[PDB]
């Protein structure tokens, strides 16, 4: 998607309607005749499944449009079926409305009073007046039935008029979940009781019971087969008589189009062949395996030719008629089953080739594999390796990714300082550009170019447009993913939303693995024993905004499962805390100052004073000493914003008051006015624990200050463990 | 100590513009073919959960199979329009009529000249929508997509 | 030219019916997180395509940074349109909104 | 045979023309509409006049110097209606 190509029209909604035979024959670019895909010598056989006029095919200008293989969208053709056959989608609908009728009166076997009652109830549900219809039922010789029907009609029309005049329902109905529920219940009861009529009510003469042994065939009993054209004509007559009653069973919003619903929709008068573009042959080096859809259409075309020939033989004219009639009937049945197979691959009789329904039904179908979860562009995957010195809101992109992934930045008067030198760099000299998308939309390439010509191109990035029509737009440079950009990092499986965060990218110089800070371990539930995860690189500013602000790693400190935190340093830093903030921890002036500058380097903005401040030594004589408590205190004092007091907090940790000696008070932690005066930092303080110091900093100074505190605490505990080890042994 | 055979030169991949599954126009599947990565249901639902609407619309639509397809305003179909051979515009087929029954006349490469049907405009959609349109019109189901600015 | 006029008139009449008057709205006066994110993204896009520059450029090049600088001084010339479930919308200018 | 035809188009405005939206619509669409035959009008457009931008807030006075212009979601472009009378020439 290009931001410089604006789209005005938008799809408000779509509606699911049956396509009719007459409509198809008007749109089609051609109807196909022969069941041969393509003749020898390599050209496609005119009139076959492929054709010049069904879409440009393998270096053959399309006849329908006149454009090449890339610039031909494809055009739709149709197959003239000699006879109308069942549509397997609607066979249960056709088989419910095939029964429940009197074949003589050509009404339903239900008394027209009940039929009209259901019609008006469903018309009231068309407009949402659900309770009004329940009173419509509260209305209780043949010439009086006409008056009863007229009274119900007046009642319904007047209720509709009042609701529309009351500002309660517009001209397009009011359809919602509850009204849908009652409509479904009403229709299901309608059908359940509509088959309860074994004897007609308009003219009480019995009718045969239609018995279907399986799809593609329906049998009558007083056994006898019934042709499909008979079923079509029967239900055509029934629908003609009861068009007013089925107009409200096959509709939910007011049919403002007022187009009559037929029985032609229930039958396959024509099959539709998608453009050739959608049945291109499986090409595998030399192997060419034609489409299963092409094979099924070839089979249906073969059956069409055979049944047409049998019909013609019968037309050119006893016993010969008997055998030709048996063969014609079998041709009918076989083409019916072949159409049923071209649509559905499980109703057939005969492992079977996938049908067009089978491209949708379950997972790996067109819904749960190419619409819900697609396969994305401008993304990368790798294996994660840990890396402190990464700010807990950053991710370390390897140079390979840092040179492949790109972003289209449009050139302005203020950007040509850096995009010009990015073009000068080239596609390999990081940072740099890999493409220039011009005003005309042309994508000038830089991969195969010389540095001299690259600089020459750079000298014309921000030129005026000599095109009257493109004066609005400007050139874009596909710059490499710089240090300022944002990346949506996810690690499958995504059991919760916090597992797909947005990090700021740091372009590491060395190795091919996504280097990620330790804090996010619980957030992704990740390890580093070869865990793989993916980085998605958004391509427009509006997408950058959400990962930078809404899904930003700072914004993700508390999981909404309980509001608890799922950040905090994990394994080494916790034990470094149990040791560094001990009473035994005393630090000379040099050691303490190095520890403080080792993590709060004020050359990028670690501390909020622009000149490090120290703390008076805890033990003055004999020589100036310090404590780890003071280390935590001065780290907090440096990271915390100025013109604001320090934190006050009382809490506990997991280490009892017996594991420190008699009369000890290290188990209870106390921060007073931004100074650590008692207690040892633990898992409870920083880690996956609630109400600790880092949680309190989050709640008081904001989430960003808590993120900076996590980075500095990690860096400090690391620099302290790289100057003082911590090991498990066999004596332990 | 043992060196296991799960090195990084086998398990790193980075995707940009390139090969696409031509029937559904989403990038092909495979490390060897330089194919993209799946953003499945569990990733889409998480992307929605953060409230990230533009992010999800960029991962799901703008990057994989975004296409500016012409749609006829009146008939509400995508795969019905076509280009017109000059003697240069876009016209429709379903709601255009043959010139035998009738300026606004446009001709195909077959020479069959039609009149009308010039009520079409651009709509940005996933290509898989167009493919579902085809695989539904094969079954006889017609999806009519009414544009907003009629 | 006459059914078109009816179409336009019905469009604008339903538009005015839905549009809540300024002095009746009952939505939260803050600029929520989603609204702030979308405002920043949209104004950044505009800046990229040579939109007007109000706030001074202290060397910034990331358009999201220029958008944040505009949001700091509330110079962003956009308008949120919060939609109610019924379809009725309340327009809130960026300035009327109190962020955090 | 010069006819004044009042048209009502749905034009799209660039970010660079938020400062002069009237001149923006004139430079983007109306100027690419002069002297060219238009089938949606009937003749050949000699000129334009009375460019008037509609509003996205119905509760604004007819002379509200600032009108809300809806912004397309994916792009930084605005899309809005404009009523304008063209001095067209029809043979």
């Amino acid at each position: 998607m290009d931001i410089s190509k604006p789209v005005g029209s938008e799809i408000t909604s779509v509606d699911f309607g049956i396509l009719t035979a007459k409509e198809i024959r008007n749109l089609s670019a051609k109807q196909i005749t022969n069941p041969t895909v393509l003749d020898n010598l390599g050209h496609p056989v005119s009139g076959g499944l492929y054709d010049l006029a069904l879409g440009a095919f393998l270096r053959n200008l399309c006849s329908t449009c006149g454009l090449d293989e890339k610039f031909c969208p494809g055009h739709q053709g149709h197959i003239e079926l000699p006879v109308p056959c069942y549509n397997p989608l609607f066979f249960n609908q056709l088989y419910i409305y095939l029964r429940a009728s009197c074949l003589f009166c050509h009404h339903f076997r239900l008394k027209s009073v009940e039929v009209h009652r259901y019609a008006c109830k469903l018309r009231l549900l068309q407009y949402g007046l659900i309770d009004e219809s329940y009173k419509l039922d509260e209305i209780t010789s043949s010439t009086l039935l006409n008056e009863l029907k007229s009274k119900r009609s007046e009642y319904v029309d007047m209720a509709i008029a009042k609701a529309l005049s009351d500002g309660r329902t517009t001209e397009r109905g009011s359809f919602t979940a509850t009204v849908n529920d009652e409509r479904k219940k009403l229709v299901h009861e309608f059908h359940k009781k509509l088959l309860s009529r074994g004897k007609c009510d308009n003219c009480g003469m019995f009718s045969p019971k239609f018995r279907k042994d399986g799809f593609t065939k329906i049998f009558e009993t007083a056994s006898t087969y019934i042709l499909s054209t008979e079923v079509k004509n029967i239900l055509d007559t029934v629908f003609r008589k009861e068009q007013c009653v089925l107009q409200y069973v096959f509709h939910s919003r007011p049919n403002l189009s007022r187009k009559l619903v037929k029985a032609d929709s229930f039958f396959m008068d024509v099959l539709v062949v998608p453009p050739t573009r959608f049945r291109l042959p499986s090409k595998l080096g030399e192997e060419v395996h034609e489409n299963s859809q092409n094979q099924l259409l070839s089979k249906v075309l073969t059956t069409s030719l055979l049944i047409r020939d049998l019909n013609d033989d019968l037309s050119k004219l006893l016993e010969d008629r008997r055998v030709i009639f048996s063969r014609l009937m079998n041709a009918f049945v076989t083409i019916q089953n072949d159409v049923n197979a071209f649509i559905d691959s499980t109703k057939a009789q005969g492992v079977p080739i996938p049908g067009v329904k089978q491209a949708l039904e379950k997972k790996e179908g067109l819904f749960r594999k190419h619409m819900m979860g697609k396969r994305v562009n401008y993304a990368a995957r790798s294996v994660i390796s840990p890396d402190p010195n990464i700010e807990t809101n950053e991710i370390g992109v390897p140079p390979v990714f840092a040179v492949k992934l790109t972003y289209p930045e449009p050139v302005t008067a203020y950007n040509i300082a850096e995009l010009r030198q990015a073009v000068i760099n080239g596609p390999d000299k990081w940072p740099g550009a890999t493409q220039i998308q011009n005003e005309d939309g042309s994508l000038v390439s830089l991969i195969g170019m010389s540095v001299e010509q690259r600089k020459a191109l750079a000298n014309q990035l921000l030129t005026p447009s000599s095109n009257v029509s493109t004066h609005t737009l400007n050139k874009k440079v596909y710059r490499h993913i710089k240090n300022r950009d944002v990346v949506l990092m996810n690690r499958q499986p995504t059991l919760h939303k916090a597992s797909m965060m947005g990090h700021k990218v740091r372009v590491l110089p060395n190795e091919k693995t996504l280097r990620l800070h330790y804090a996010n371990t619980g957030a992704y539930n990740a390890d580093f024993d070869g865990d793989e995860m993916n980085m998605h690189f958004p391509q427009n500013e509006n997408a950058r905004a959400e990962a930078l602000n809404l899904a930003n790693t700072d914004s993700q400190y508390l999981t909404p499962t309980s509001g608890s935190p799922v950040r905090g340093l994990i394994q080494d830093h916790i034990s470094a805390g149990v040791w560094l903030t001990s009473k035994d921890s005393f630090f000379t002036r040099e050691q303490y100052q190095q520890y403080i500058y080792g993590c709060i380097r004020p050359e990028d903005g670690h501390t909020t004073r622009s000149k490090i401040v120290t703390l008076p030594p805890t033990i003055f004589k004999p020589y100036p000493l310090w404590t780890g408590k003071q280390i935590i205190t001065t780290v907090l004092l440096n990271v915390t914003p100025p013109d604001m007091p320090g934190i006050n907090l009382i809490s506990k940790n997991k280490i009892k008051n017996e594991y420190w000696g008699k009369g000890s008070l290290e188990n209870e932690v106390l921060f007073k006015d931004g100074a650590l005066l008692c207690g040892i930092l633990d898992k409870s303080q920083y880690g996956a624990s609630k109400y600790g110091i880092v949680h309190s900093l989050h709640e008081v100074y904001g989430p960003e200050v808590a993120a900076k505190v996590l980075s500095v605490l990690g860096r400090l505990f690391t620099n302290y463990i790289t100057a003082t080890a911590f090991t498990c042994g066999m004596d332990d | 100590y043992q060196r296991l055979r799960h090195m990084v030169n086998d398990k790193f991949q980075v995707r940009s513009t390139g090969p696409v599954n031509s029937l559904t126009m989403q990038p092909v599947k495979g490390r060897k073919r330089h194919g993209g990565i799946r953003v499945g249901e569990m990733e889409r639902d998480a992307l929605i959960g953060h409230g990230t609407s533009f992010l999800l619309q960029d991962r799901l639509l703008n990057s994989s199979d975004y296409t500016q397809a012409s749609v006829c305003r009146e008939c509400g179909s995508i795969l019905t329009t076509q280009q017109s051979v000059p003697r240069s515009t876009v016209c429709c087929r379903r709601c255009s009529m043959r010139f035998e029954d009738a300026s606004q006349i446009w001709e195909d490469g077959q020479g069959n000249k039609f009149v009308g049907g010039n009520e079409t405009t651009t709509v940005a959609i996933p290509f898989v929508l167009k493919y579902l349109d085809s695989e539904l019109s094969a079954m006889g189901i017609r999806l009519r997509y009414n544009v907003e600015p009629k | 030219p006459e059914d078109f006029q009816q179409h336009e008139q019905i469009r604008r009449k339903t538009l005015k019916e839905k549009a809540i008057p300024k002095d009746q709205r009952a939505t939260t006066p803050y600029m929520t997180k989603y609204e702030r994110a979308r405002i920043l993204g949209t104004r950044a896009l505009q800046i990229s395509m040579n939109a007007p520059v109000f706030v001074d450029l202290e060397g910034e090049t990331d358009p999201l940074r220029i958008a944040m600088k505009e949001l700091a001084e509330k110079k962003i010339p956009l308008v949120i349109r919060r939609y109610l479930p019924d379809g009725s919308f309340e327009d809130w200018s960026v300035e009327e909104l109190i962020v955090d | 045979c010069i006819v004044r035809v009042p048209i009502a188009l749905y034009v799209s405005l660039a970010p660079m023309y938020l400062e002069n939206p009237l001149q923006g619509v004139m430079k983007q669409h109306l100027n690419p509409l002069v002297m060219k035959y238009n089938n949606k009008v009937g003749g050949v457009v000699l000129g334009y006049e009375g460019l008037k931008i509609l509003d996205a807030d119905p509760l604004s006075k007819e002379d509200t110097s600032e009108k809300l212009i809806k912004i397309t979601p994916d792009t930084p472009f605005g899309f809005t209606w404009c009523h304008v009378n063209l001095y067209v020439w029809q043979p």
């Binding site: 190509k5 005005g8 029209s9 | - | 078109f4 | 035809v5 749905y10 669409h29």
Partner: peptide, 18 residues
């Protein structure tokens, strides 16, 4: 040429010609 950047999406006649 002749895209949404350069051509109106929908151009109607408000009334009859005058």
């Amino acid at each position: 040429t002749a895209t949404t950047l350069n051509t109106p999406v929908v151009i109607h006649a408000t009334q009859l010609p005058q």
